[PDB]
Structure to design on (104 residues):
């Protein structure tokens, strides 16, 4: 019956074509106004195309479609005594090599 913050997903890096997963499972549902979801460098308008925000009960879900070298910025969220932060960054260097061979 309380409003204790259970778990928050922070710290996220998204390369080109990747996706972002930010959610905050609370103990109480908050309407629209006491909850603030924004990343410095790109305010999410009700019609935001790159970012998507929703609120259903005690669960707040926010994502990032295909990350592009420009969405980089800080991550700050606040609610019912629910303080949060993070660091969002996108890689634009195709210097990231990956192993395409699972096994040999």
């Amino acid at each position: 019956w309380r409003l204790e913050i259970l778990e928050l997903l922070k710290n996220a890096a998204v390369r080109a074509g990747a996706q972002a997963c930010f959610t905050c499972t609370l103990s109480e549902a908050v309407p629209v106004g006491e909850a603030s979801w924004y990343i410095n460098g790109a305010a999410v308008q009700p019609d935001d195309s790159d970012w998507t925000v929703t609120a259903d009960g005690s669960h707040h879900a926010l994502l990032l479609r295909s990350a592009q070298p420009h969405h980089a910025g800080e991550v700050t969220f606040a609610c019912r005594d629910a303080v949060a932060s993070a660091r969002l960054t996108v890689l634009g260097l195709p210097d990231g090599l990956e192993h395409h061979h699972h096994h040999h």
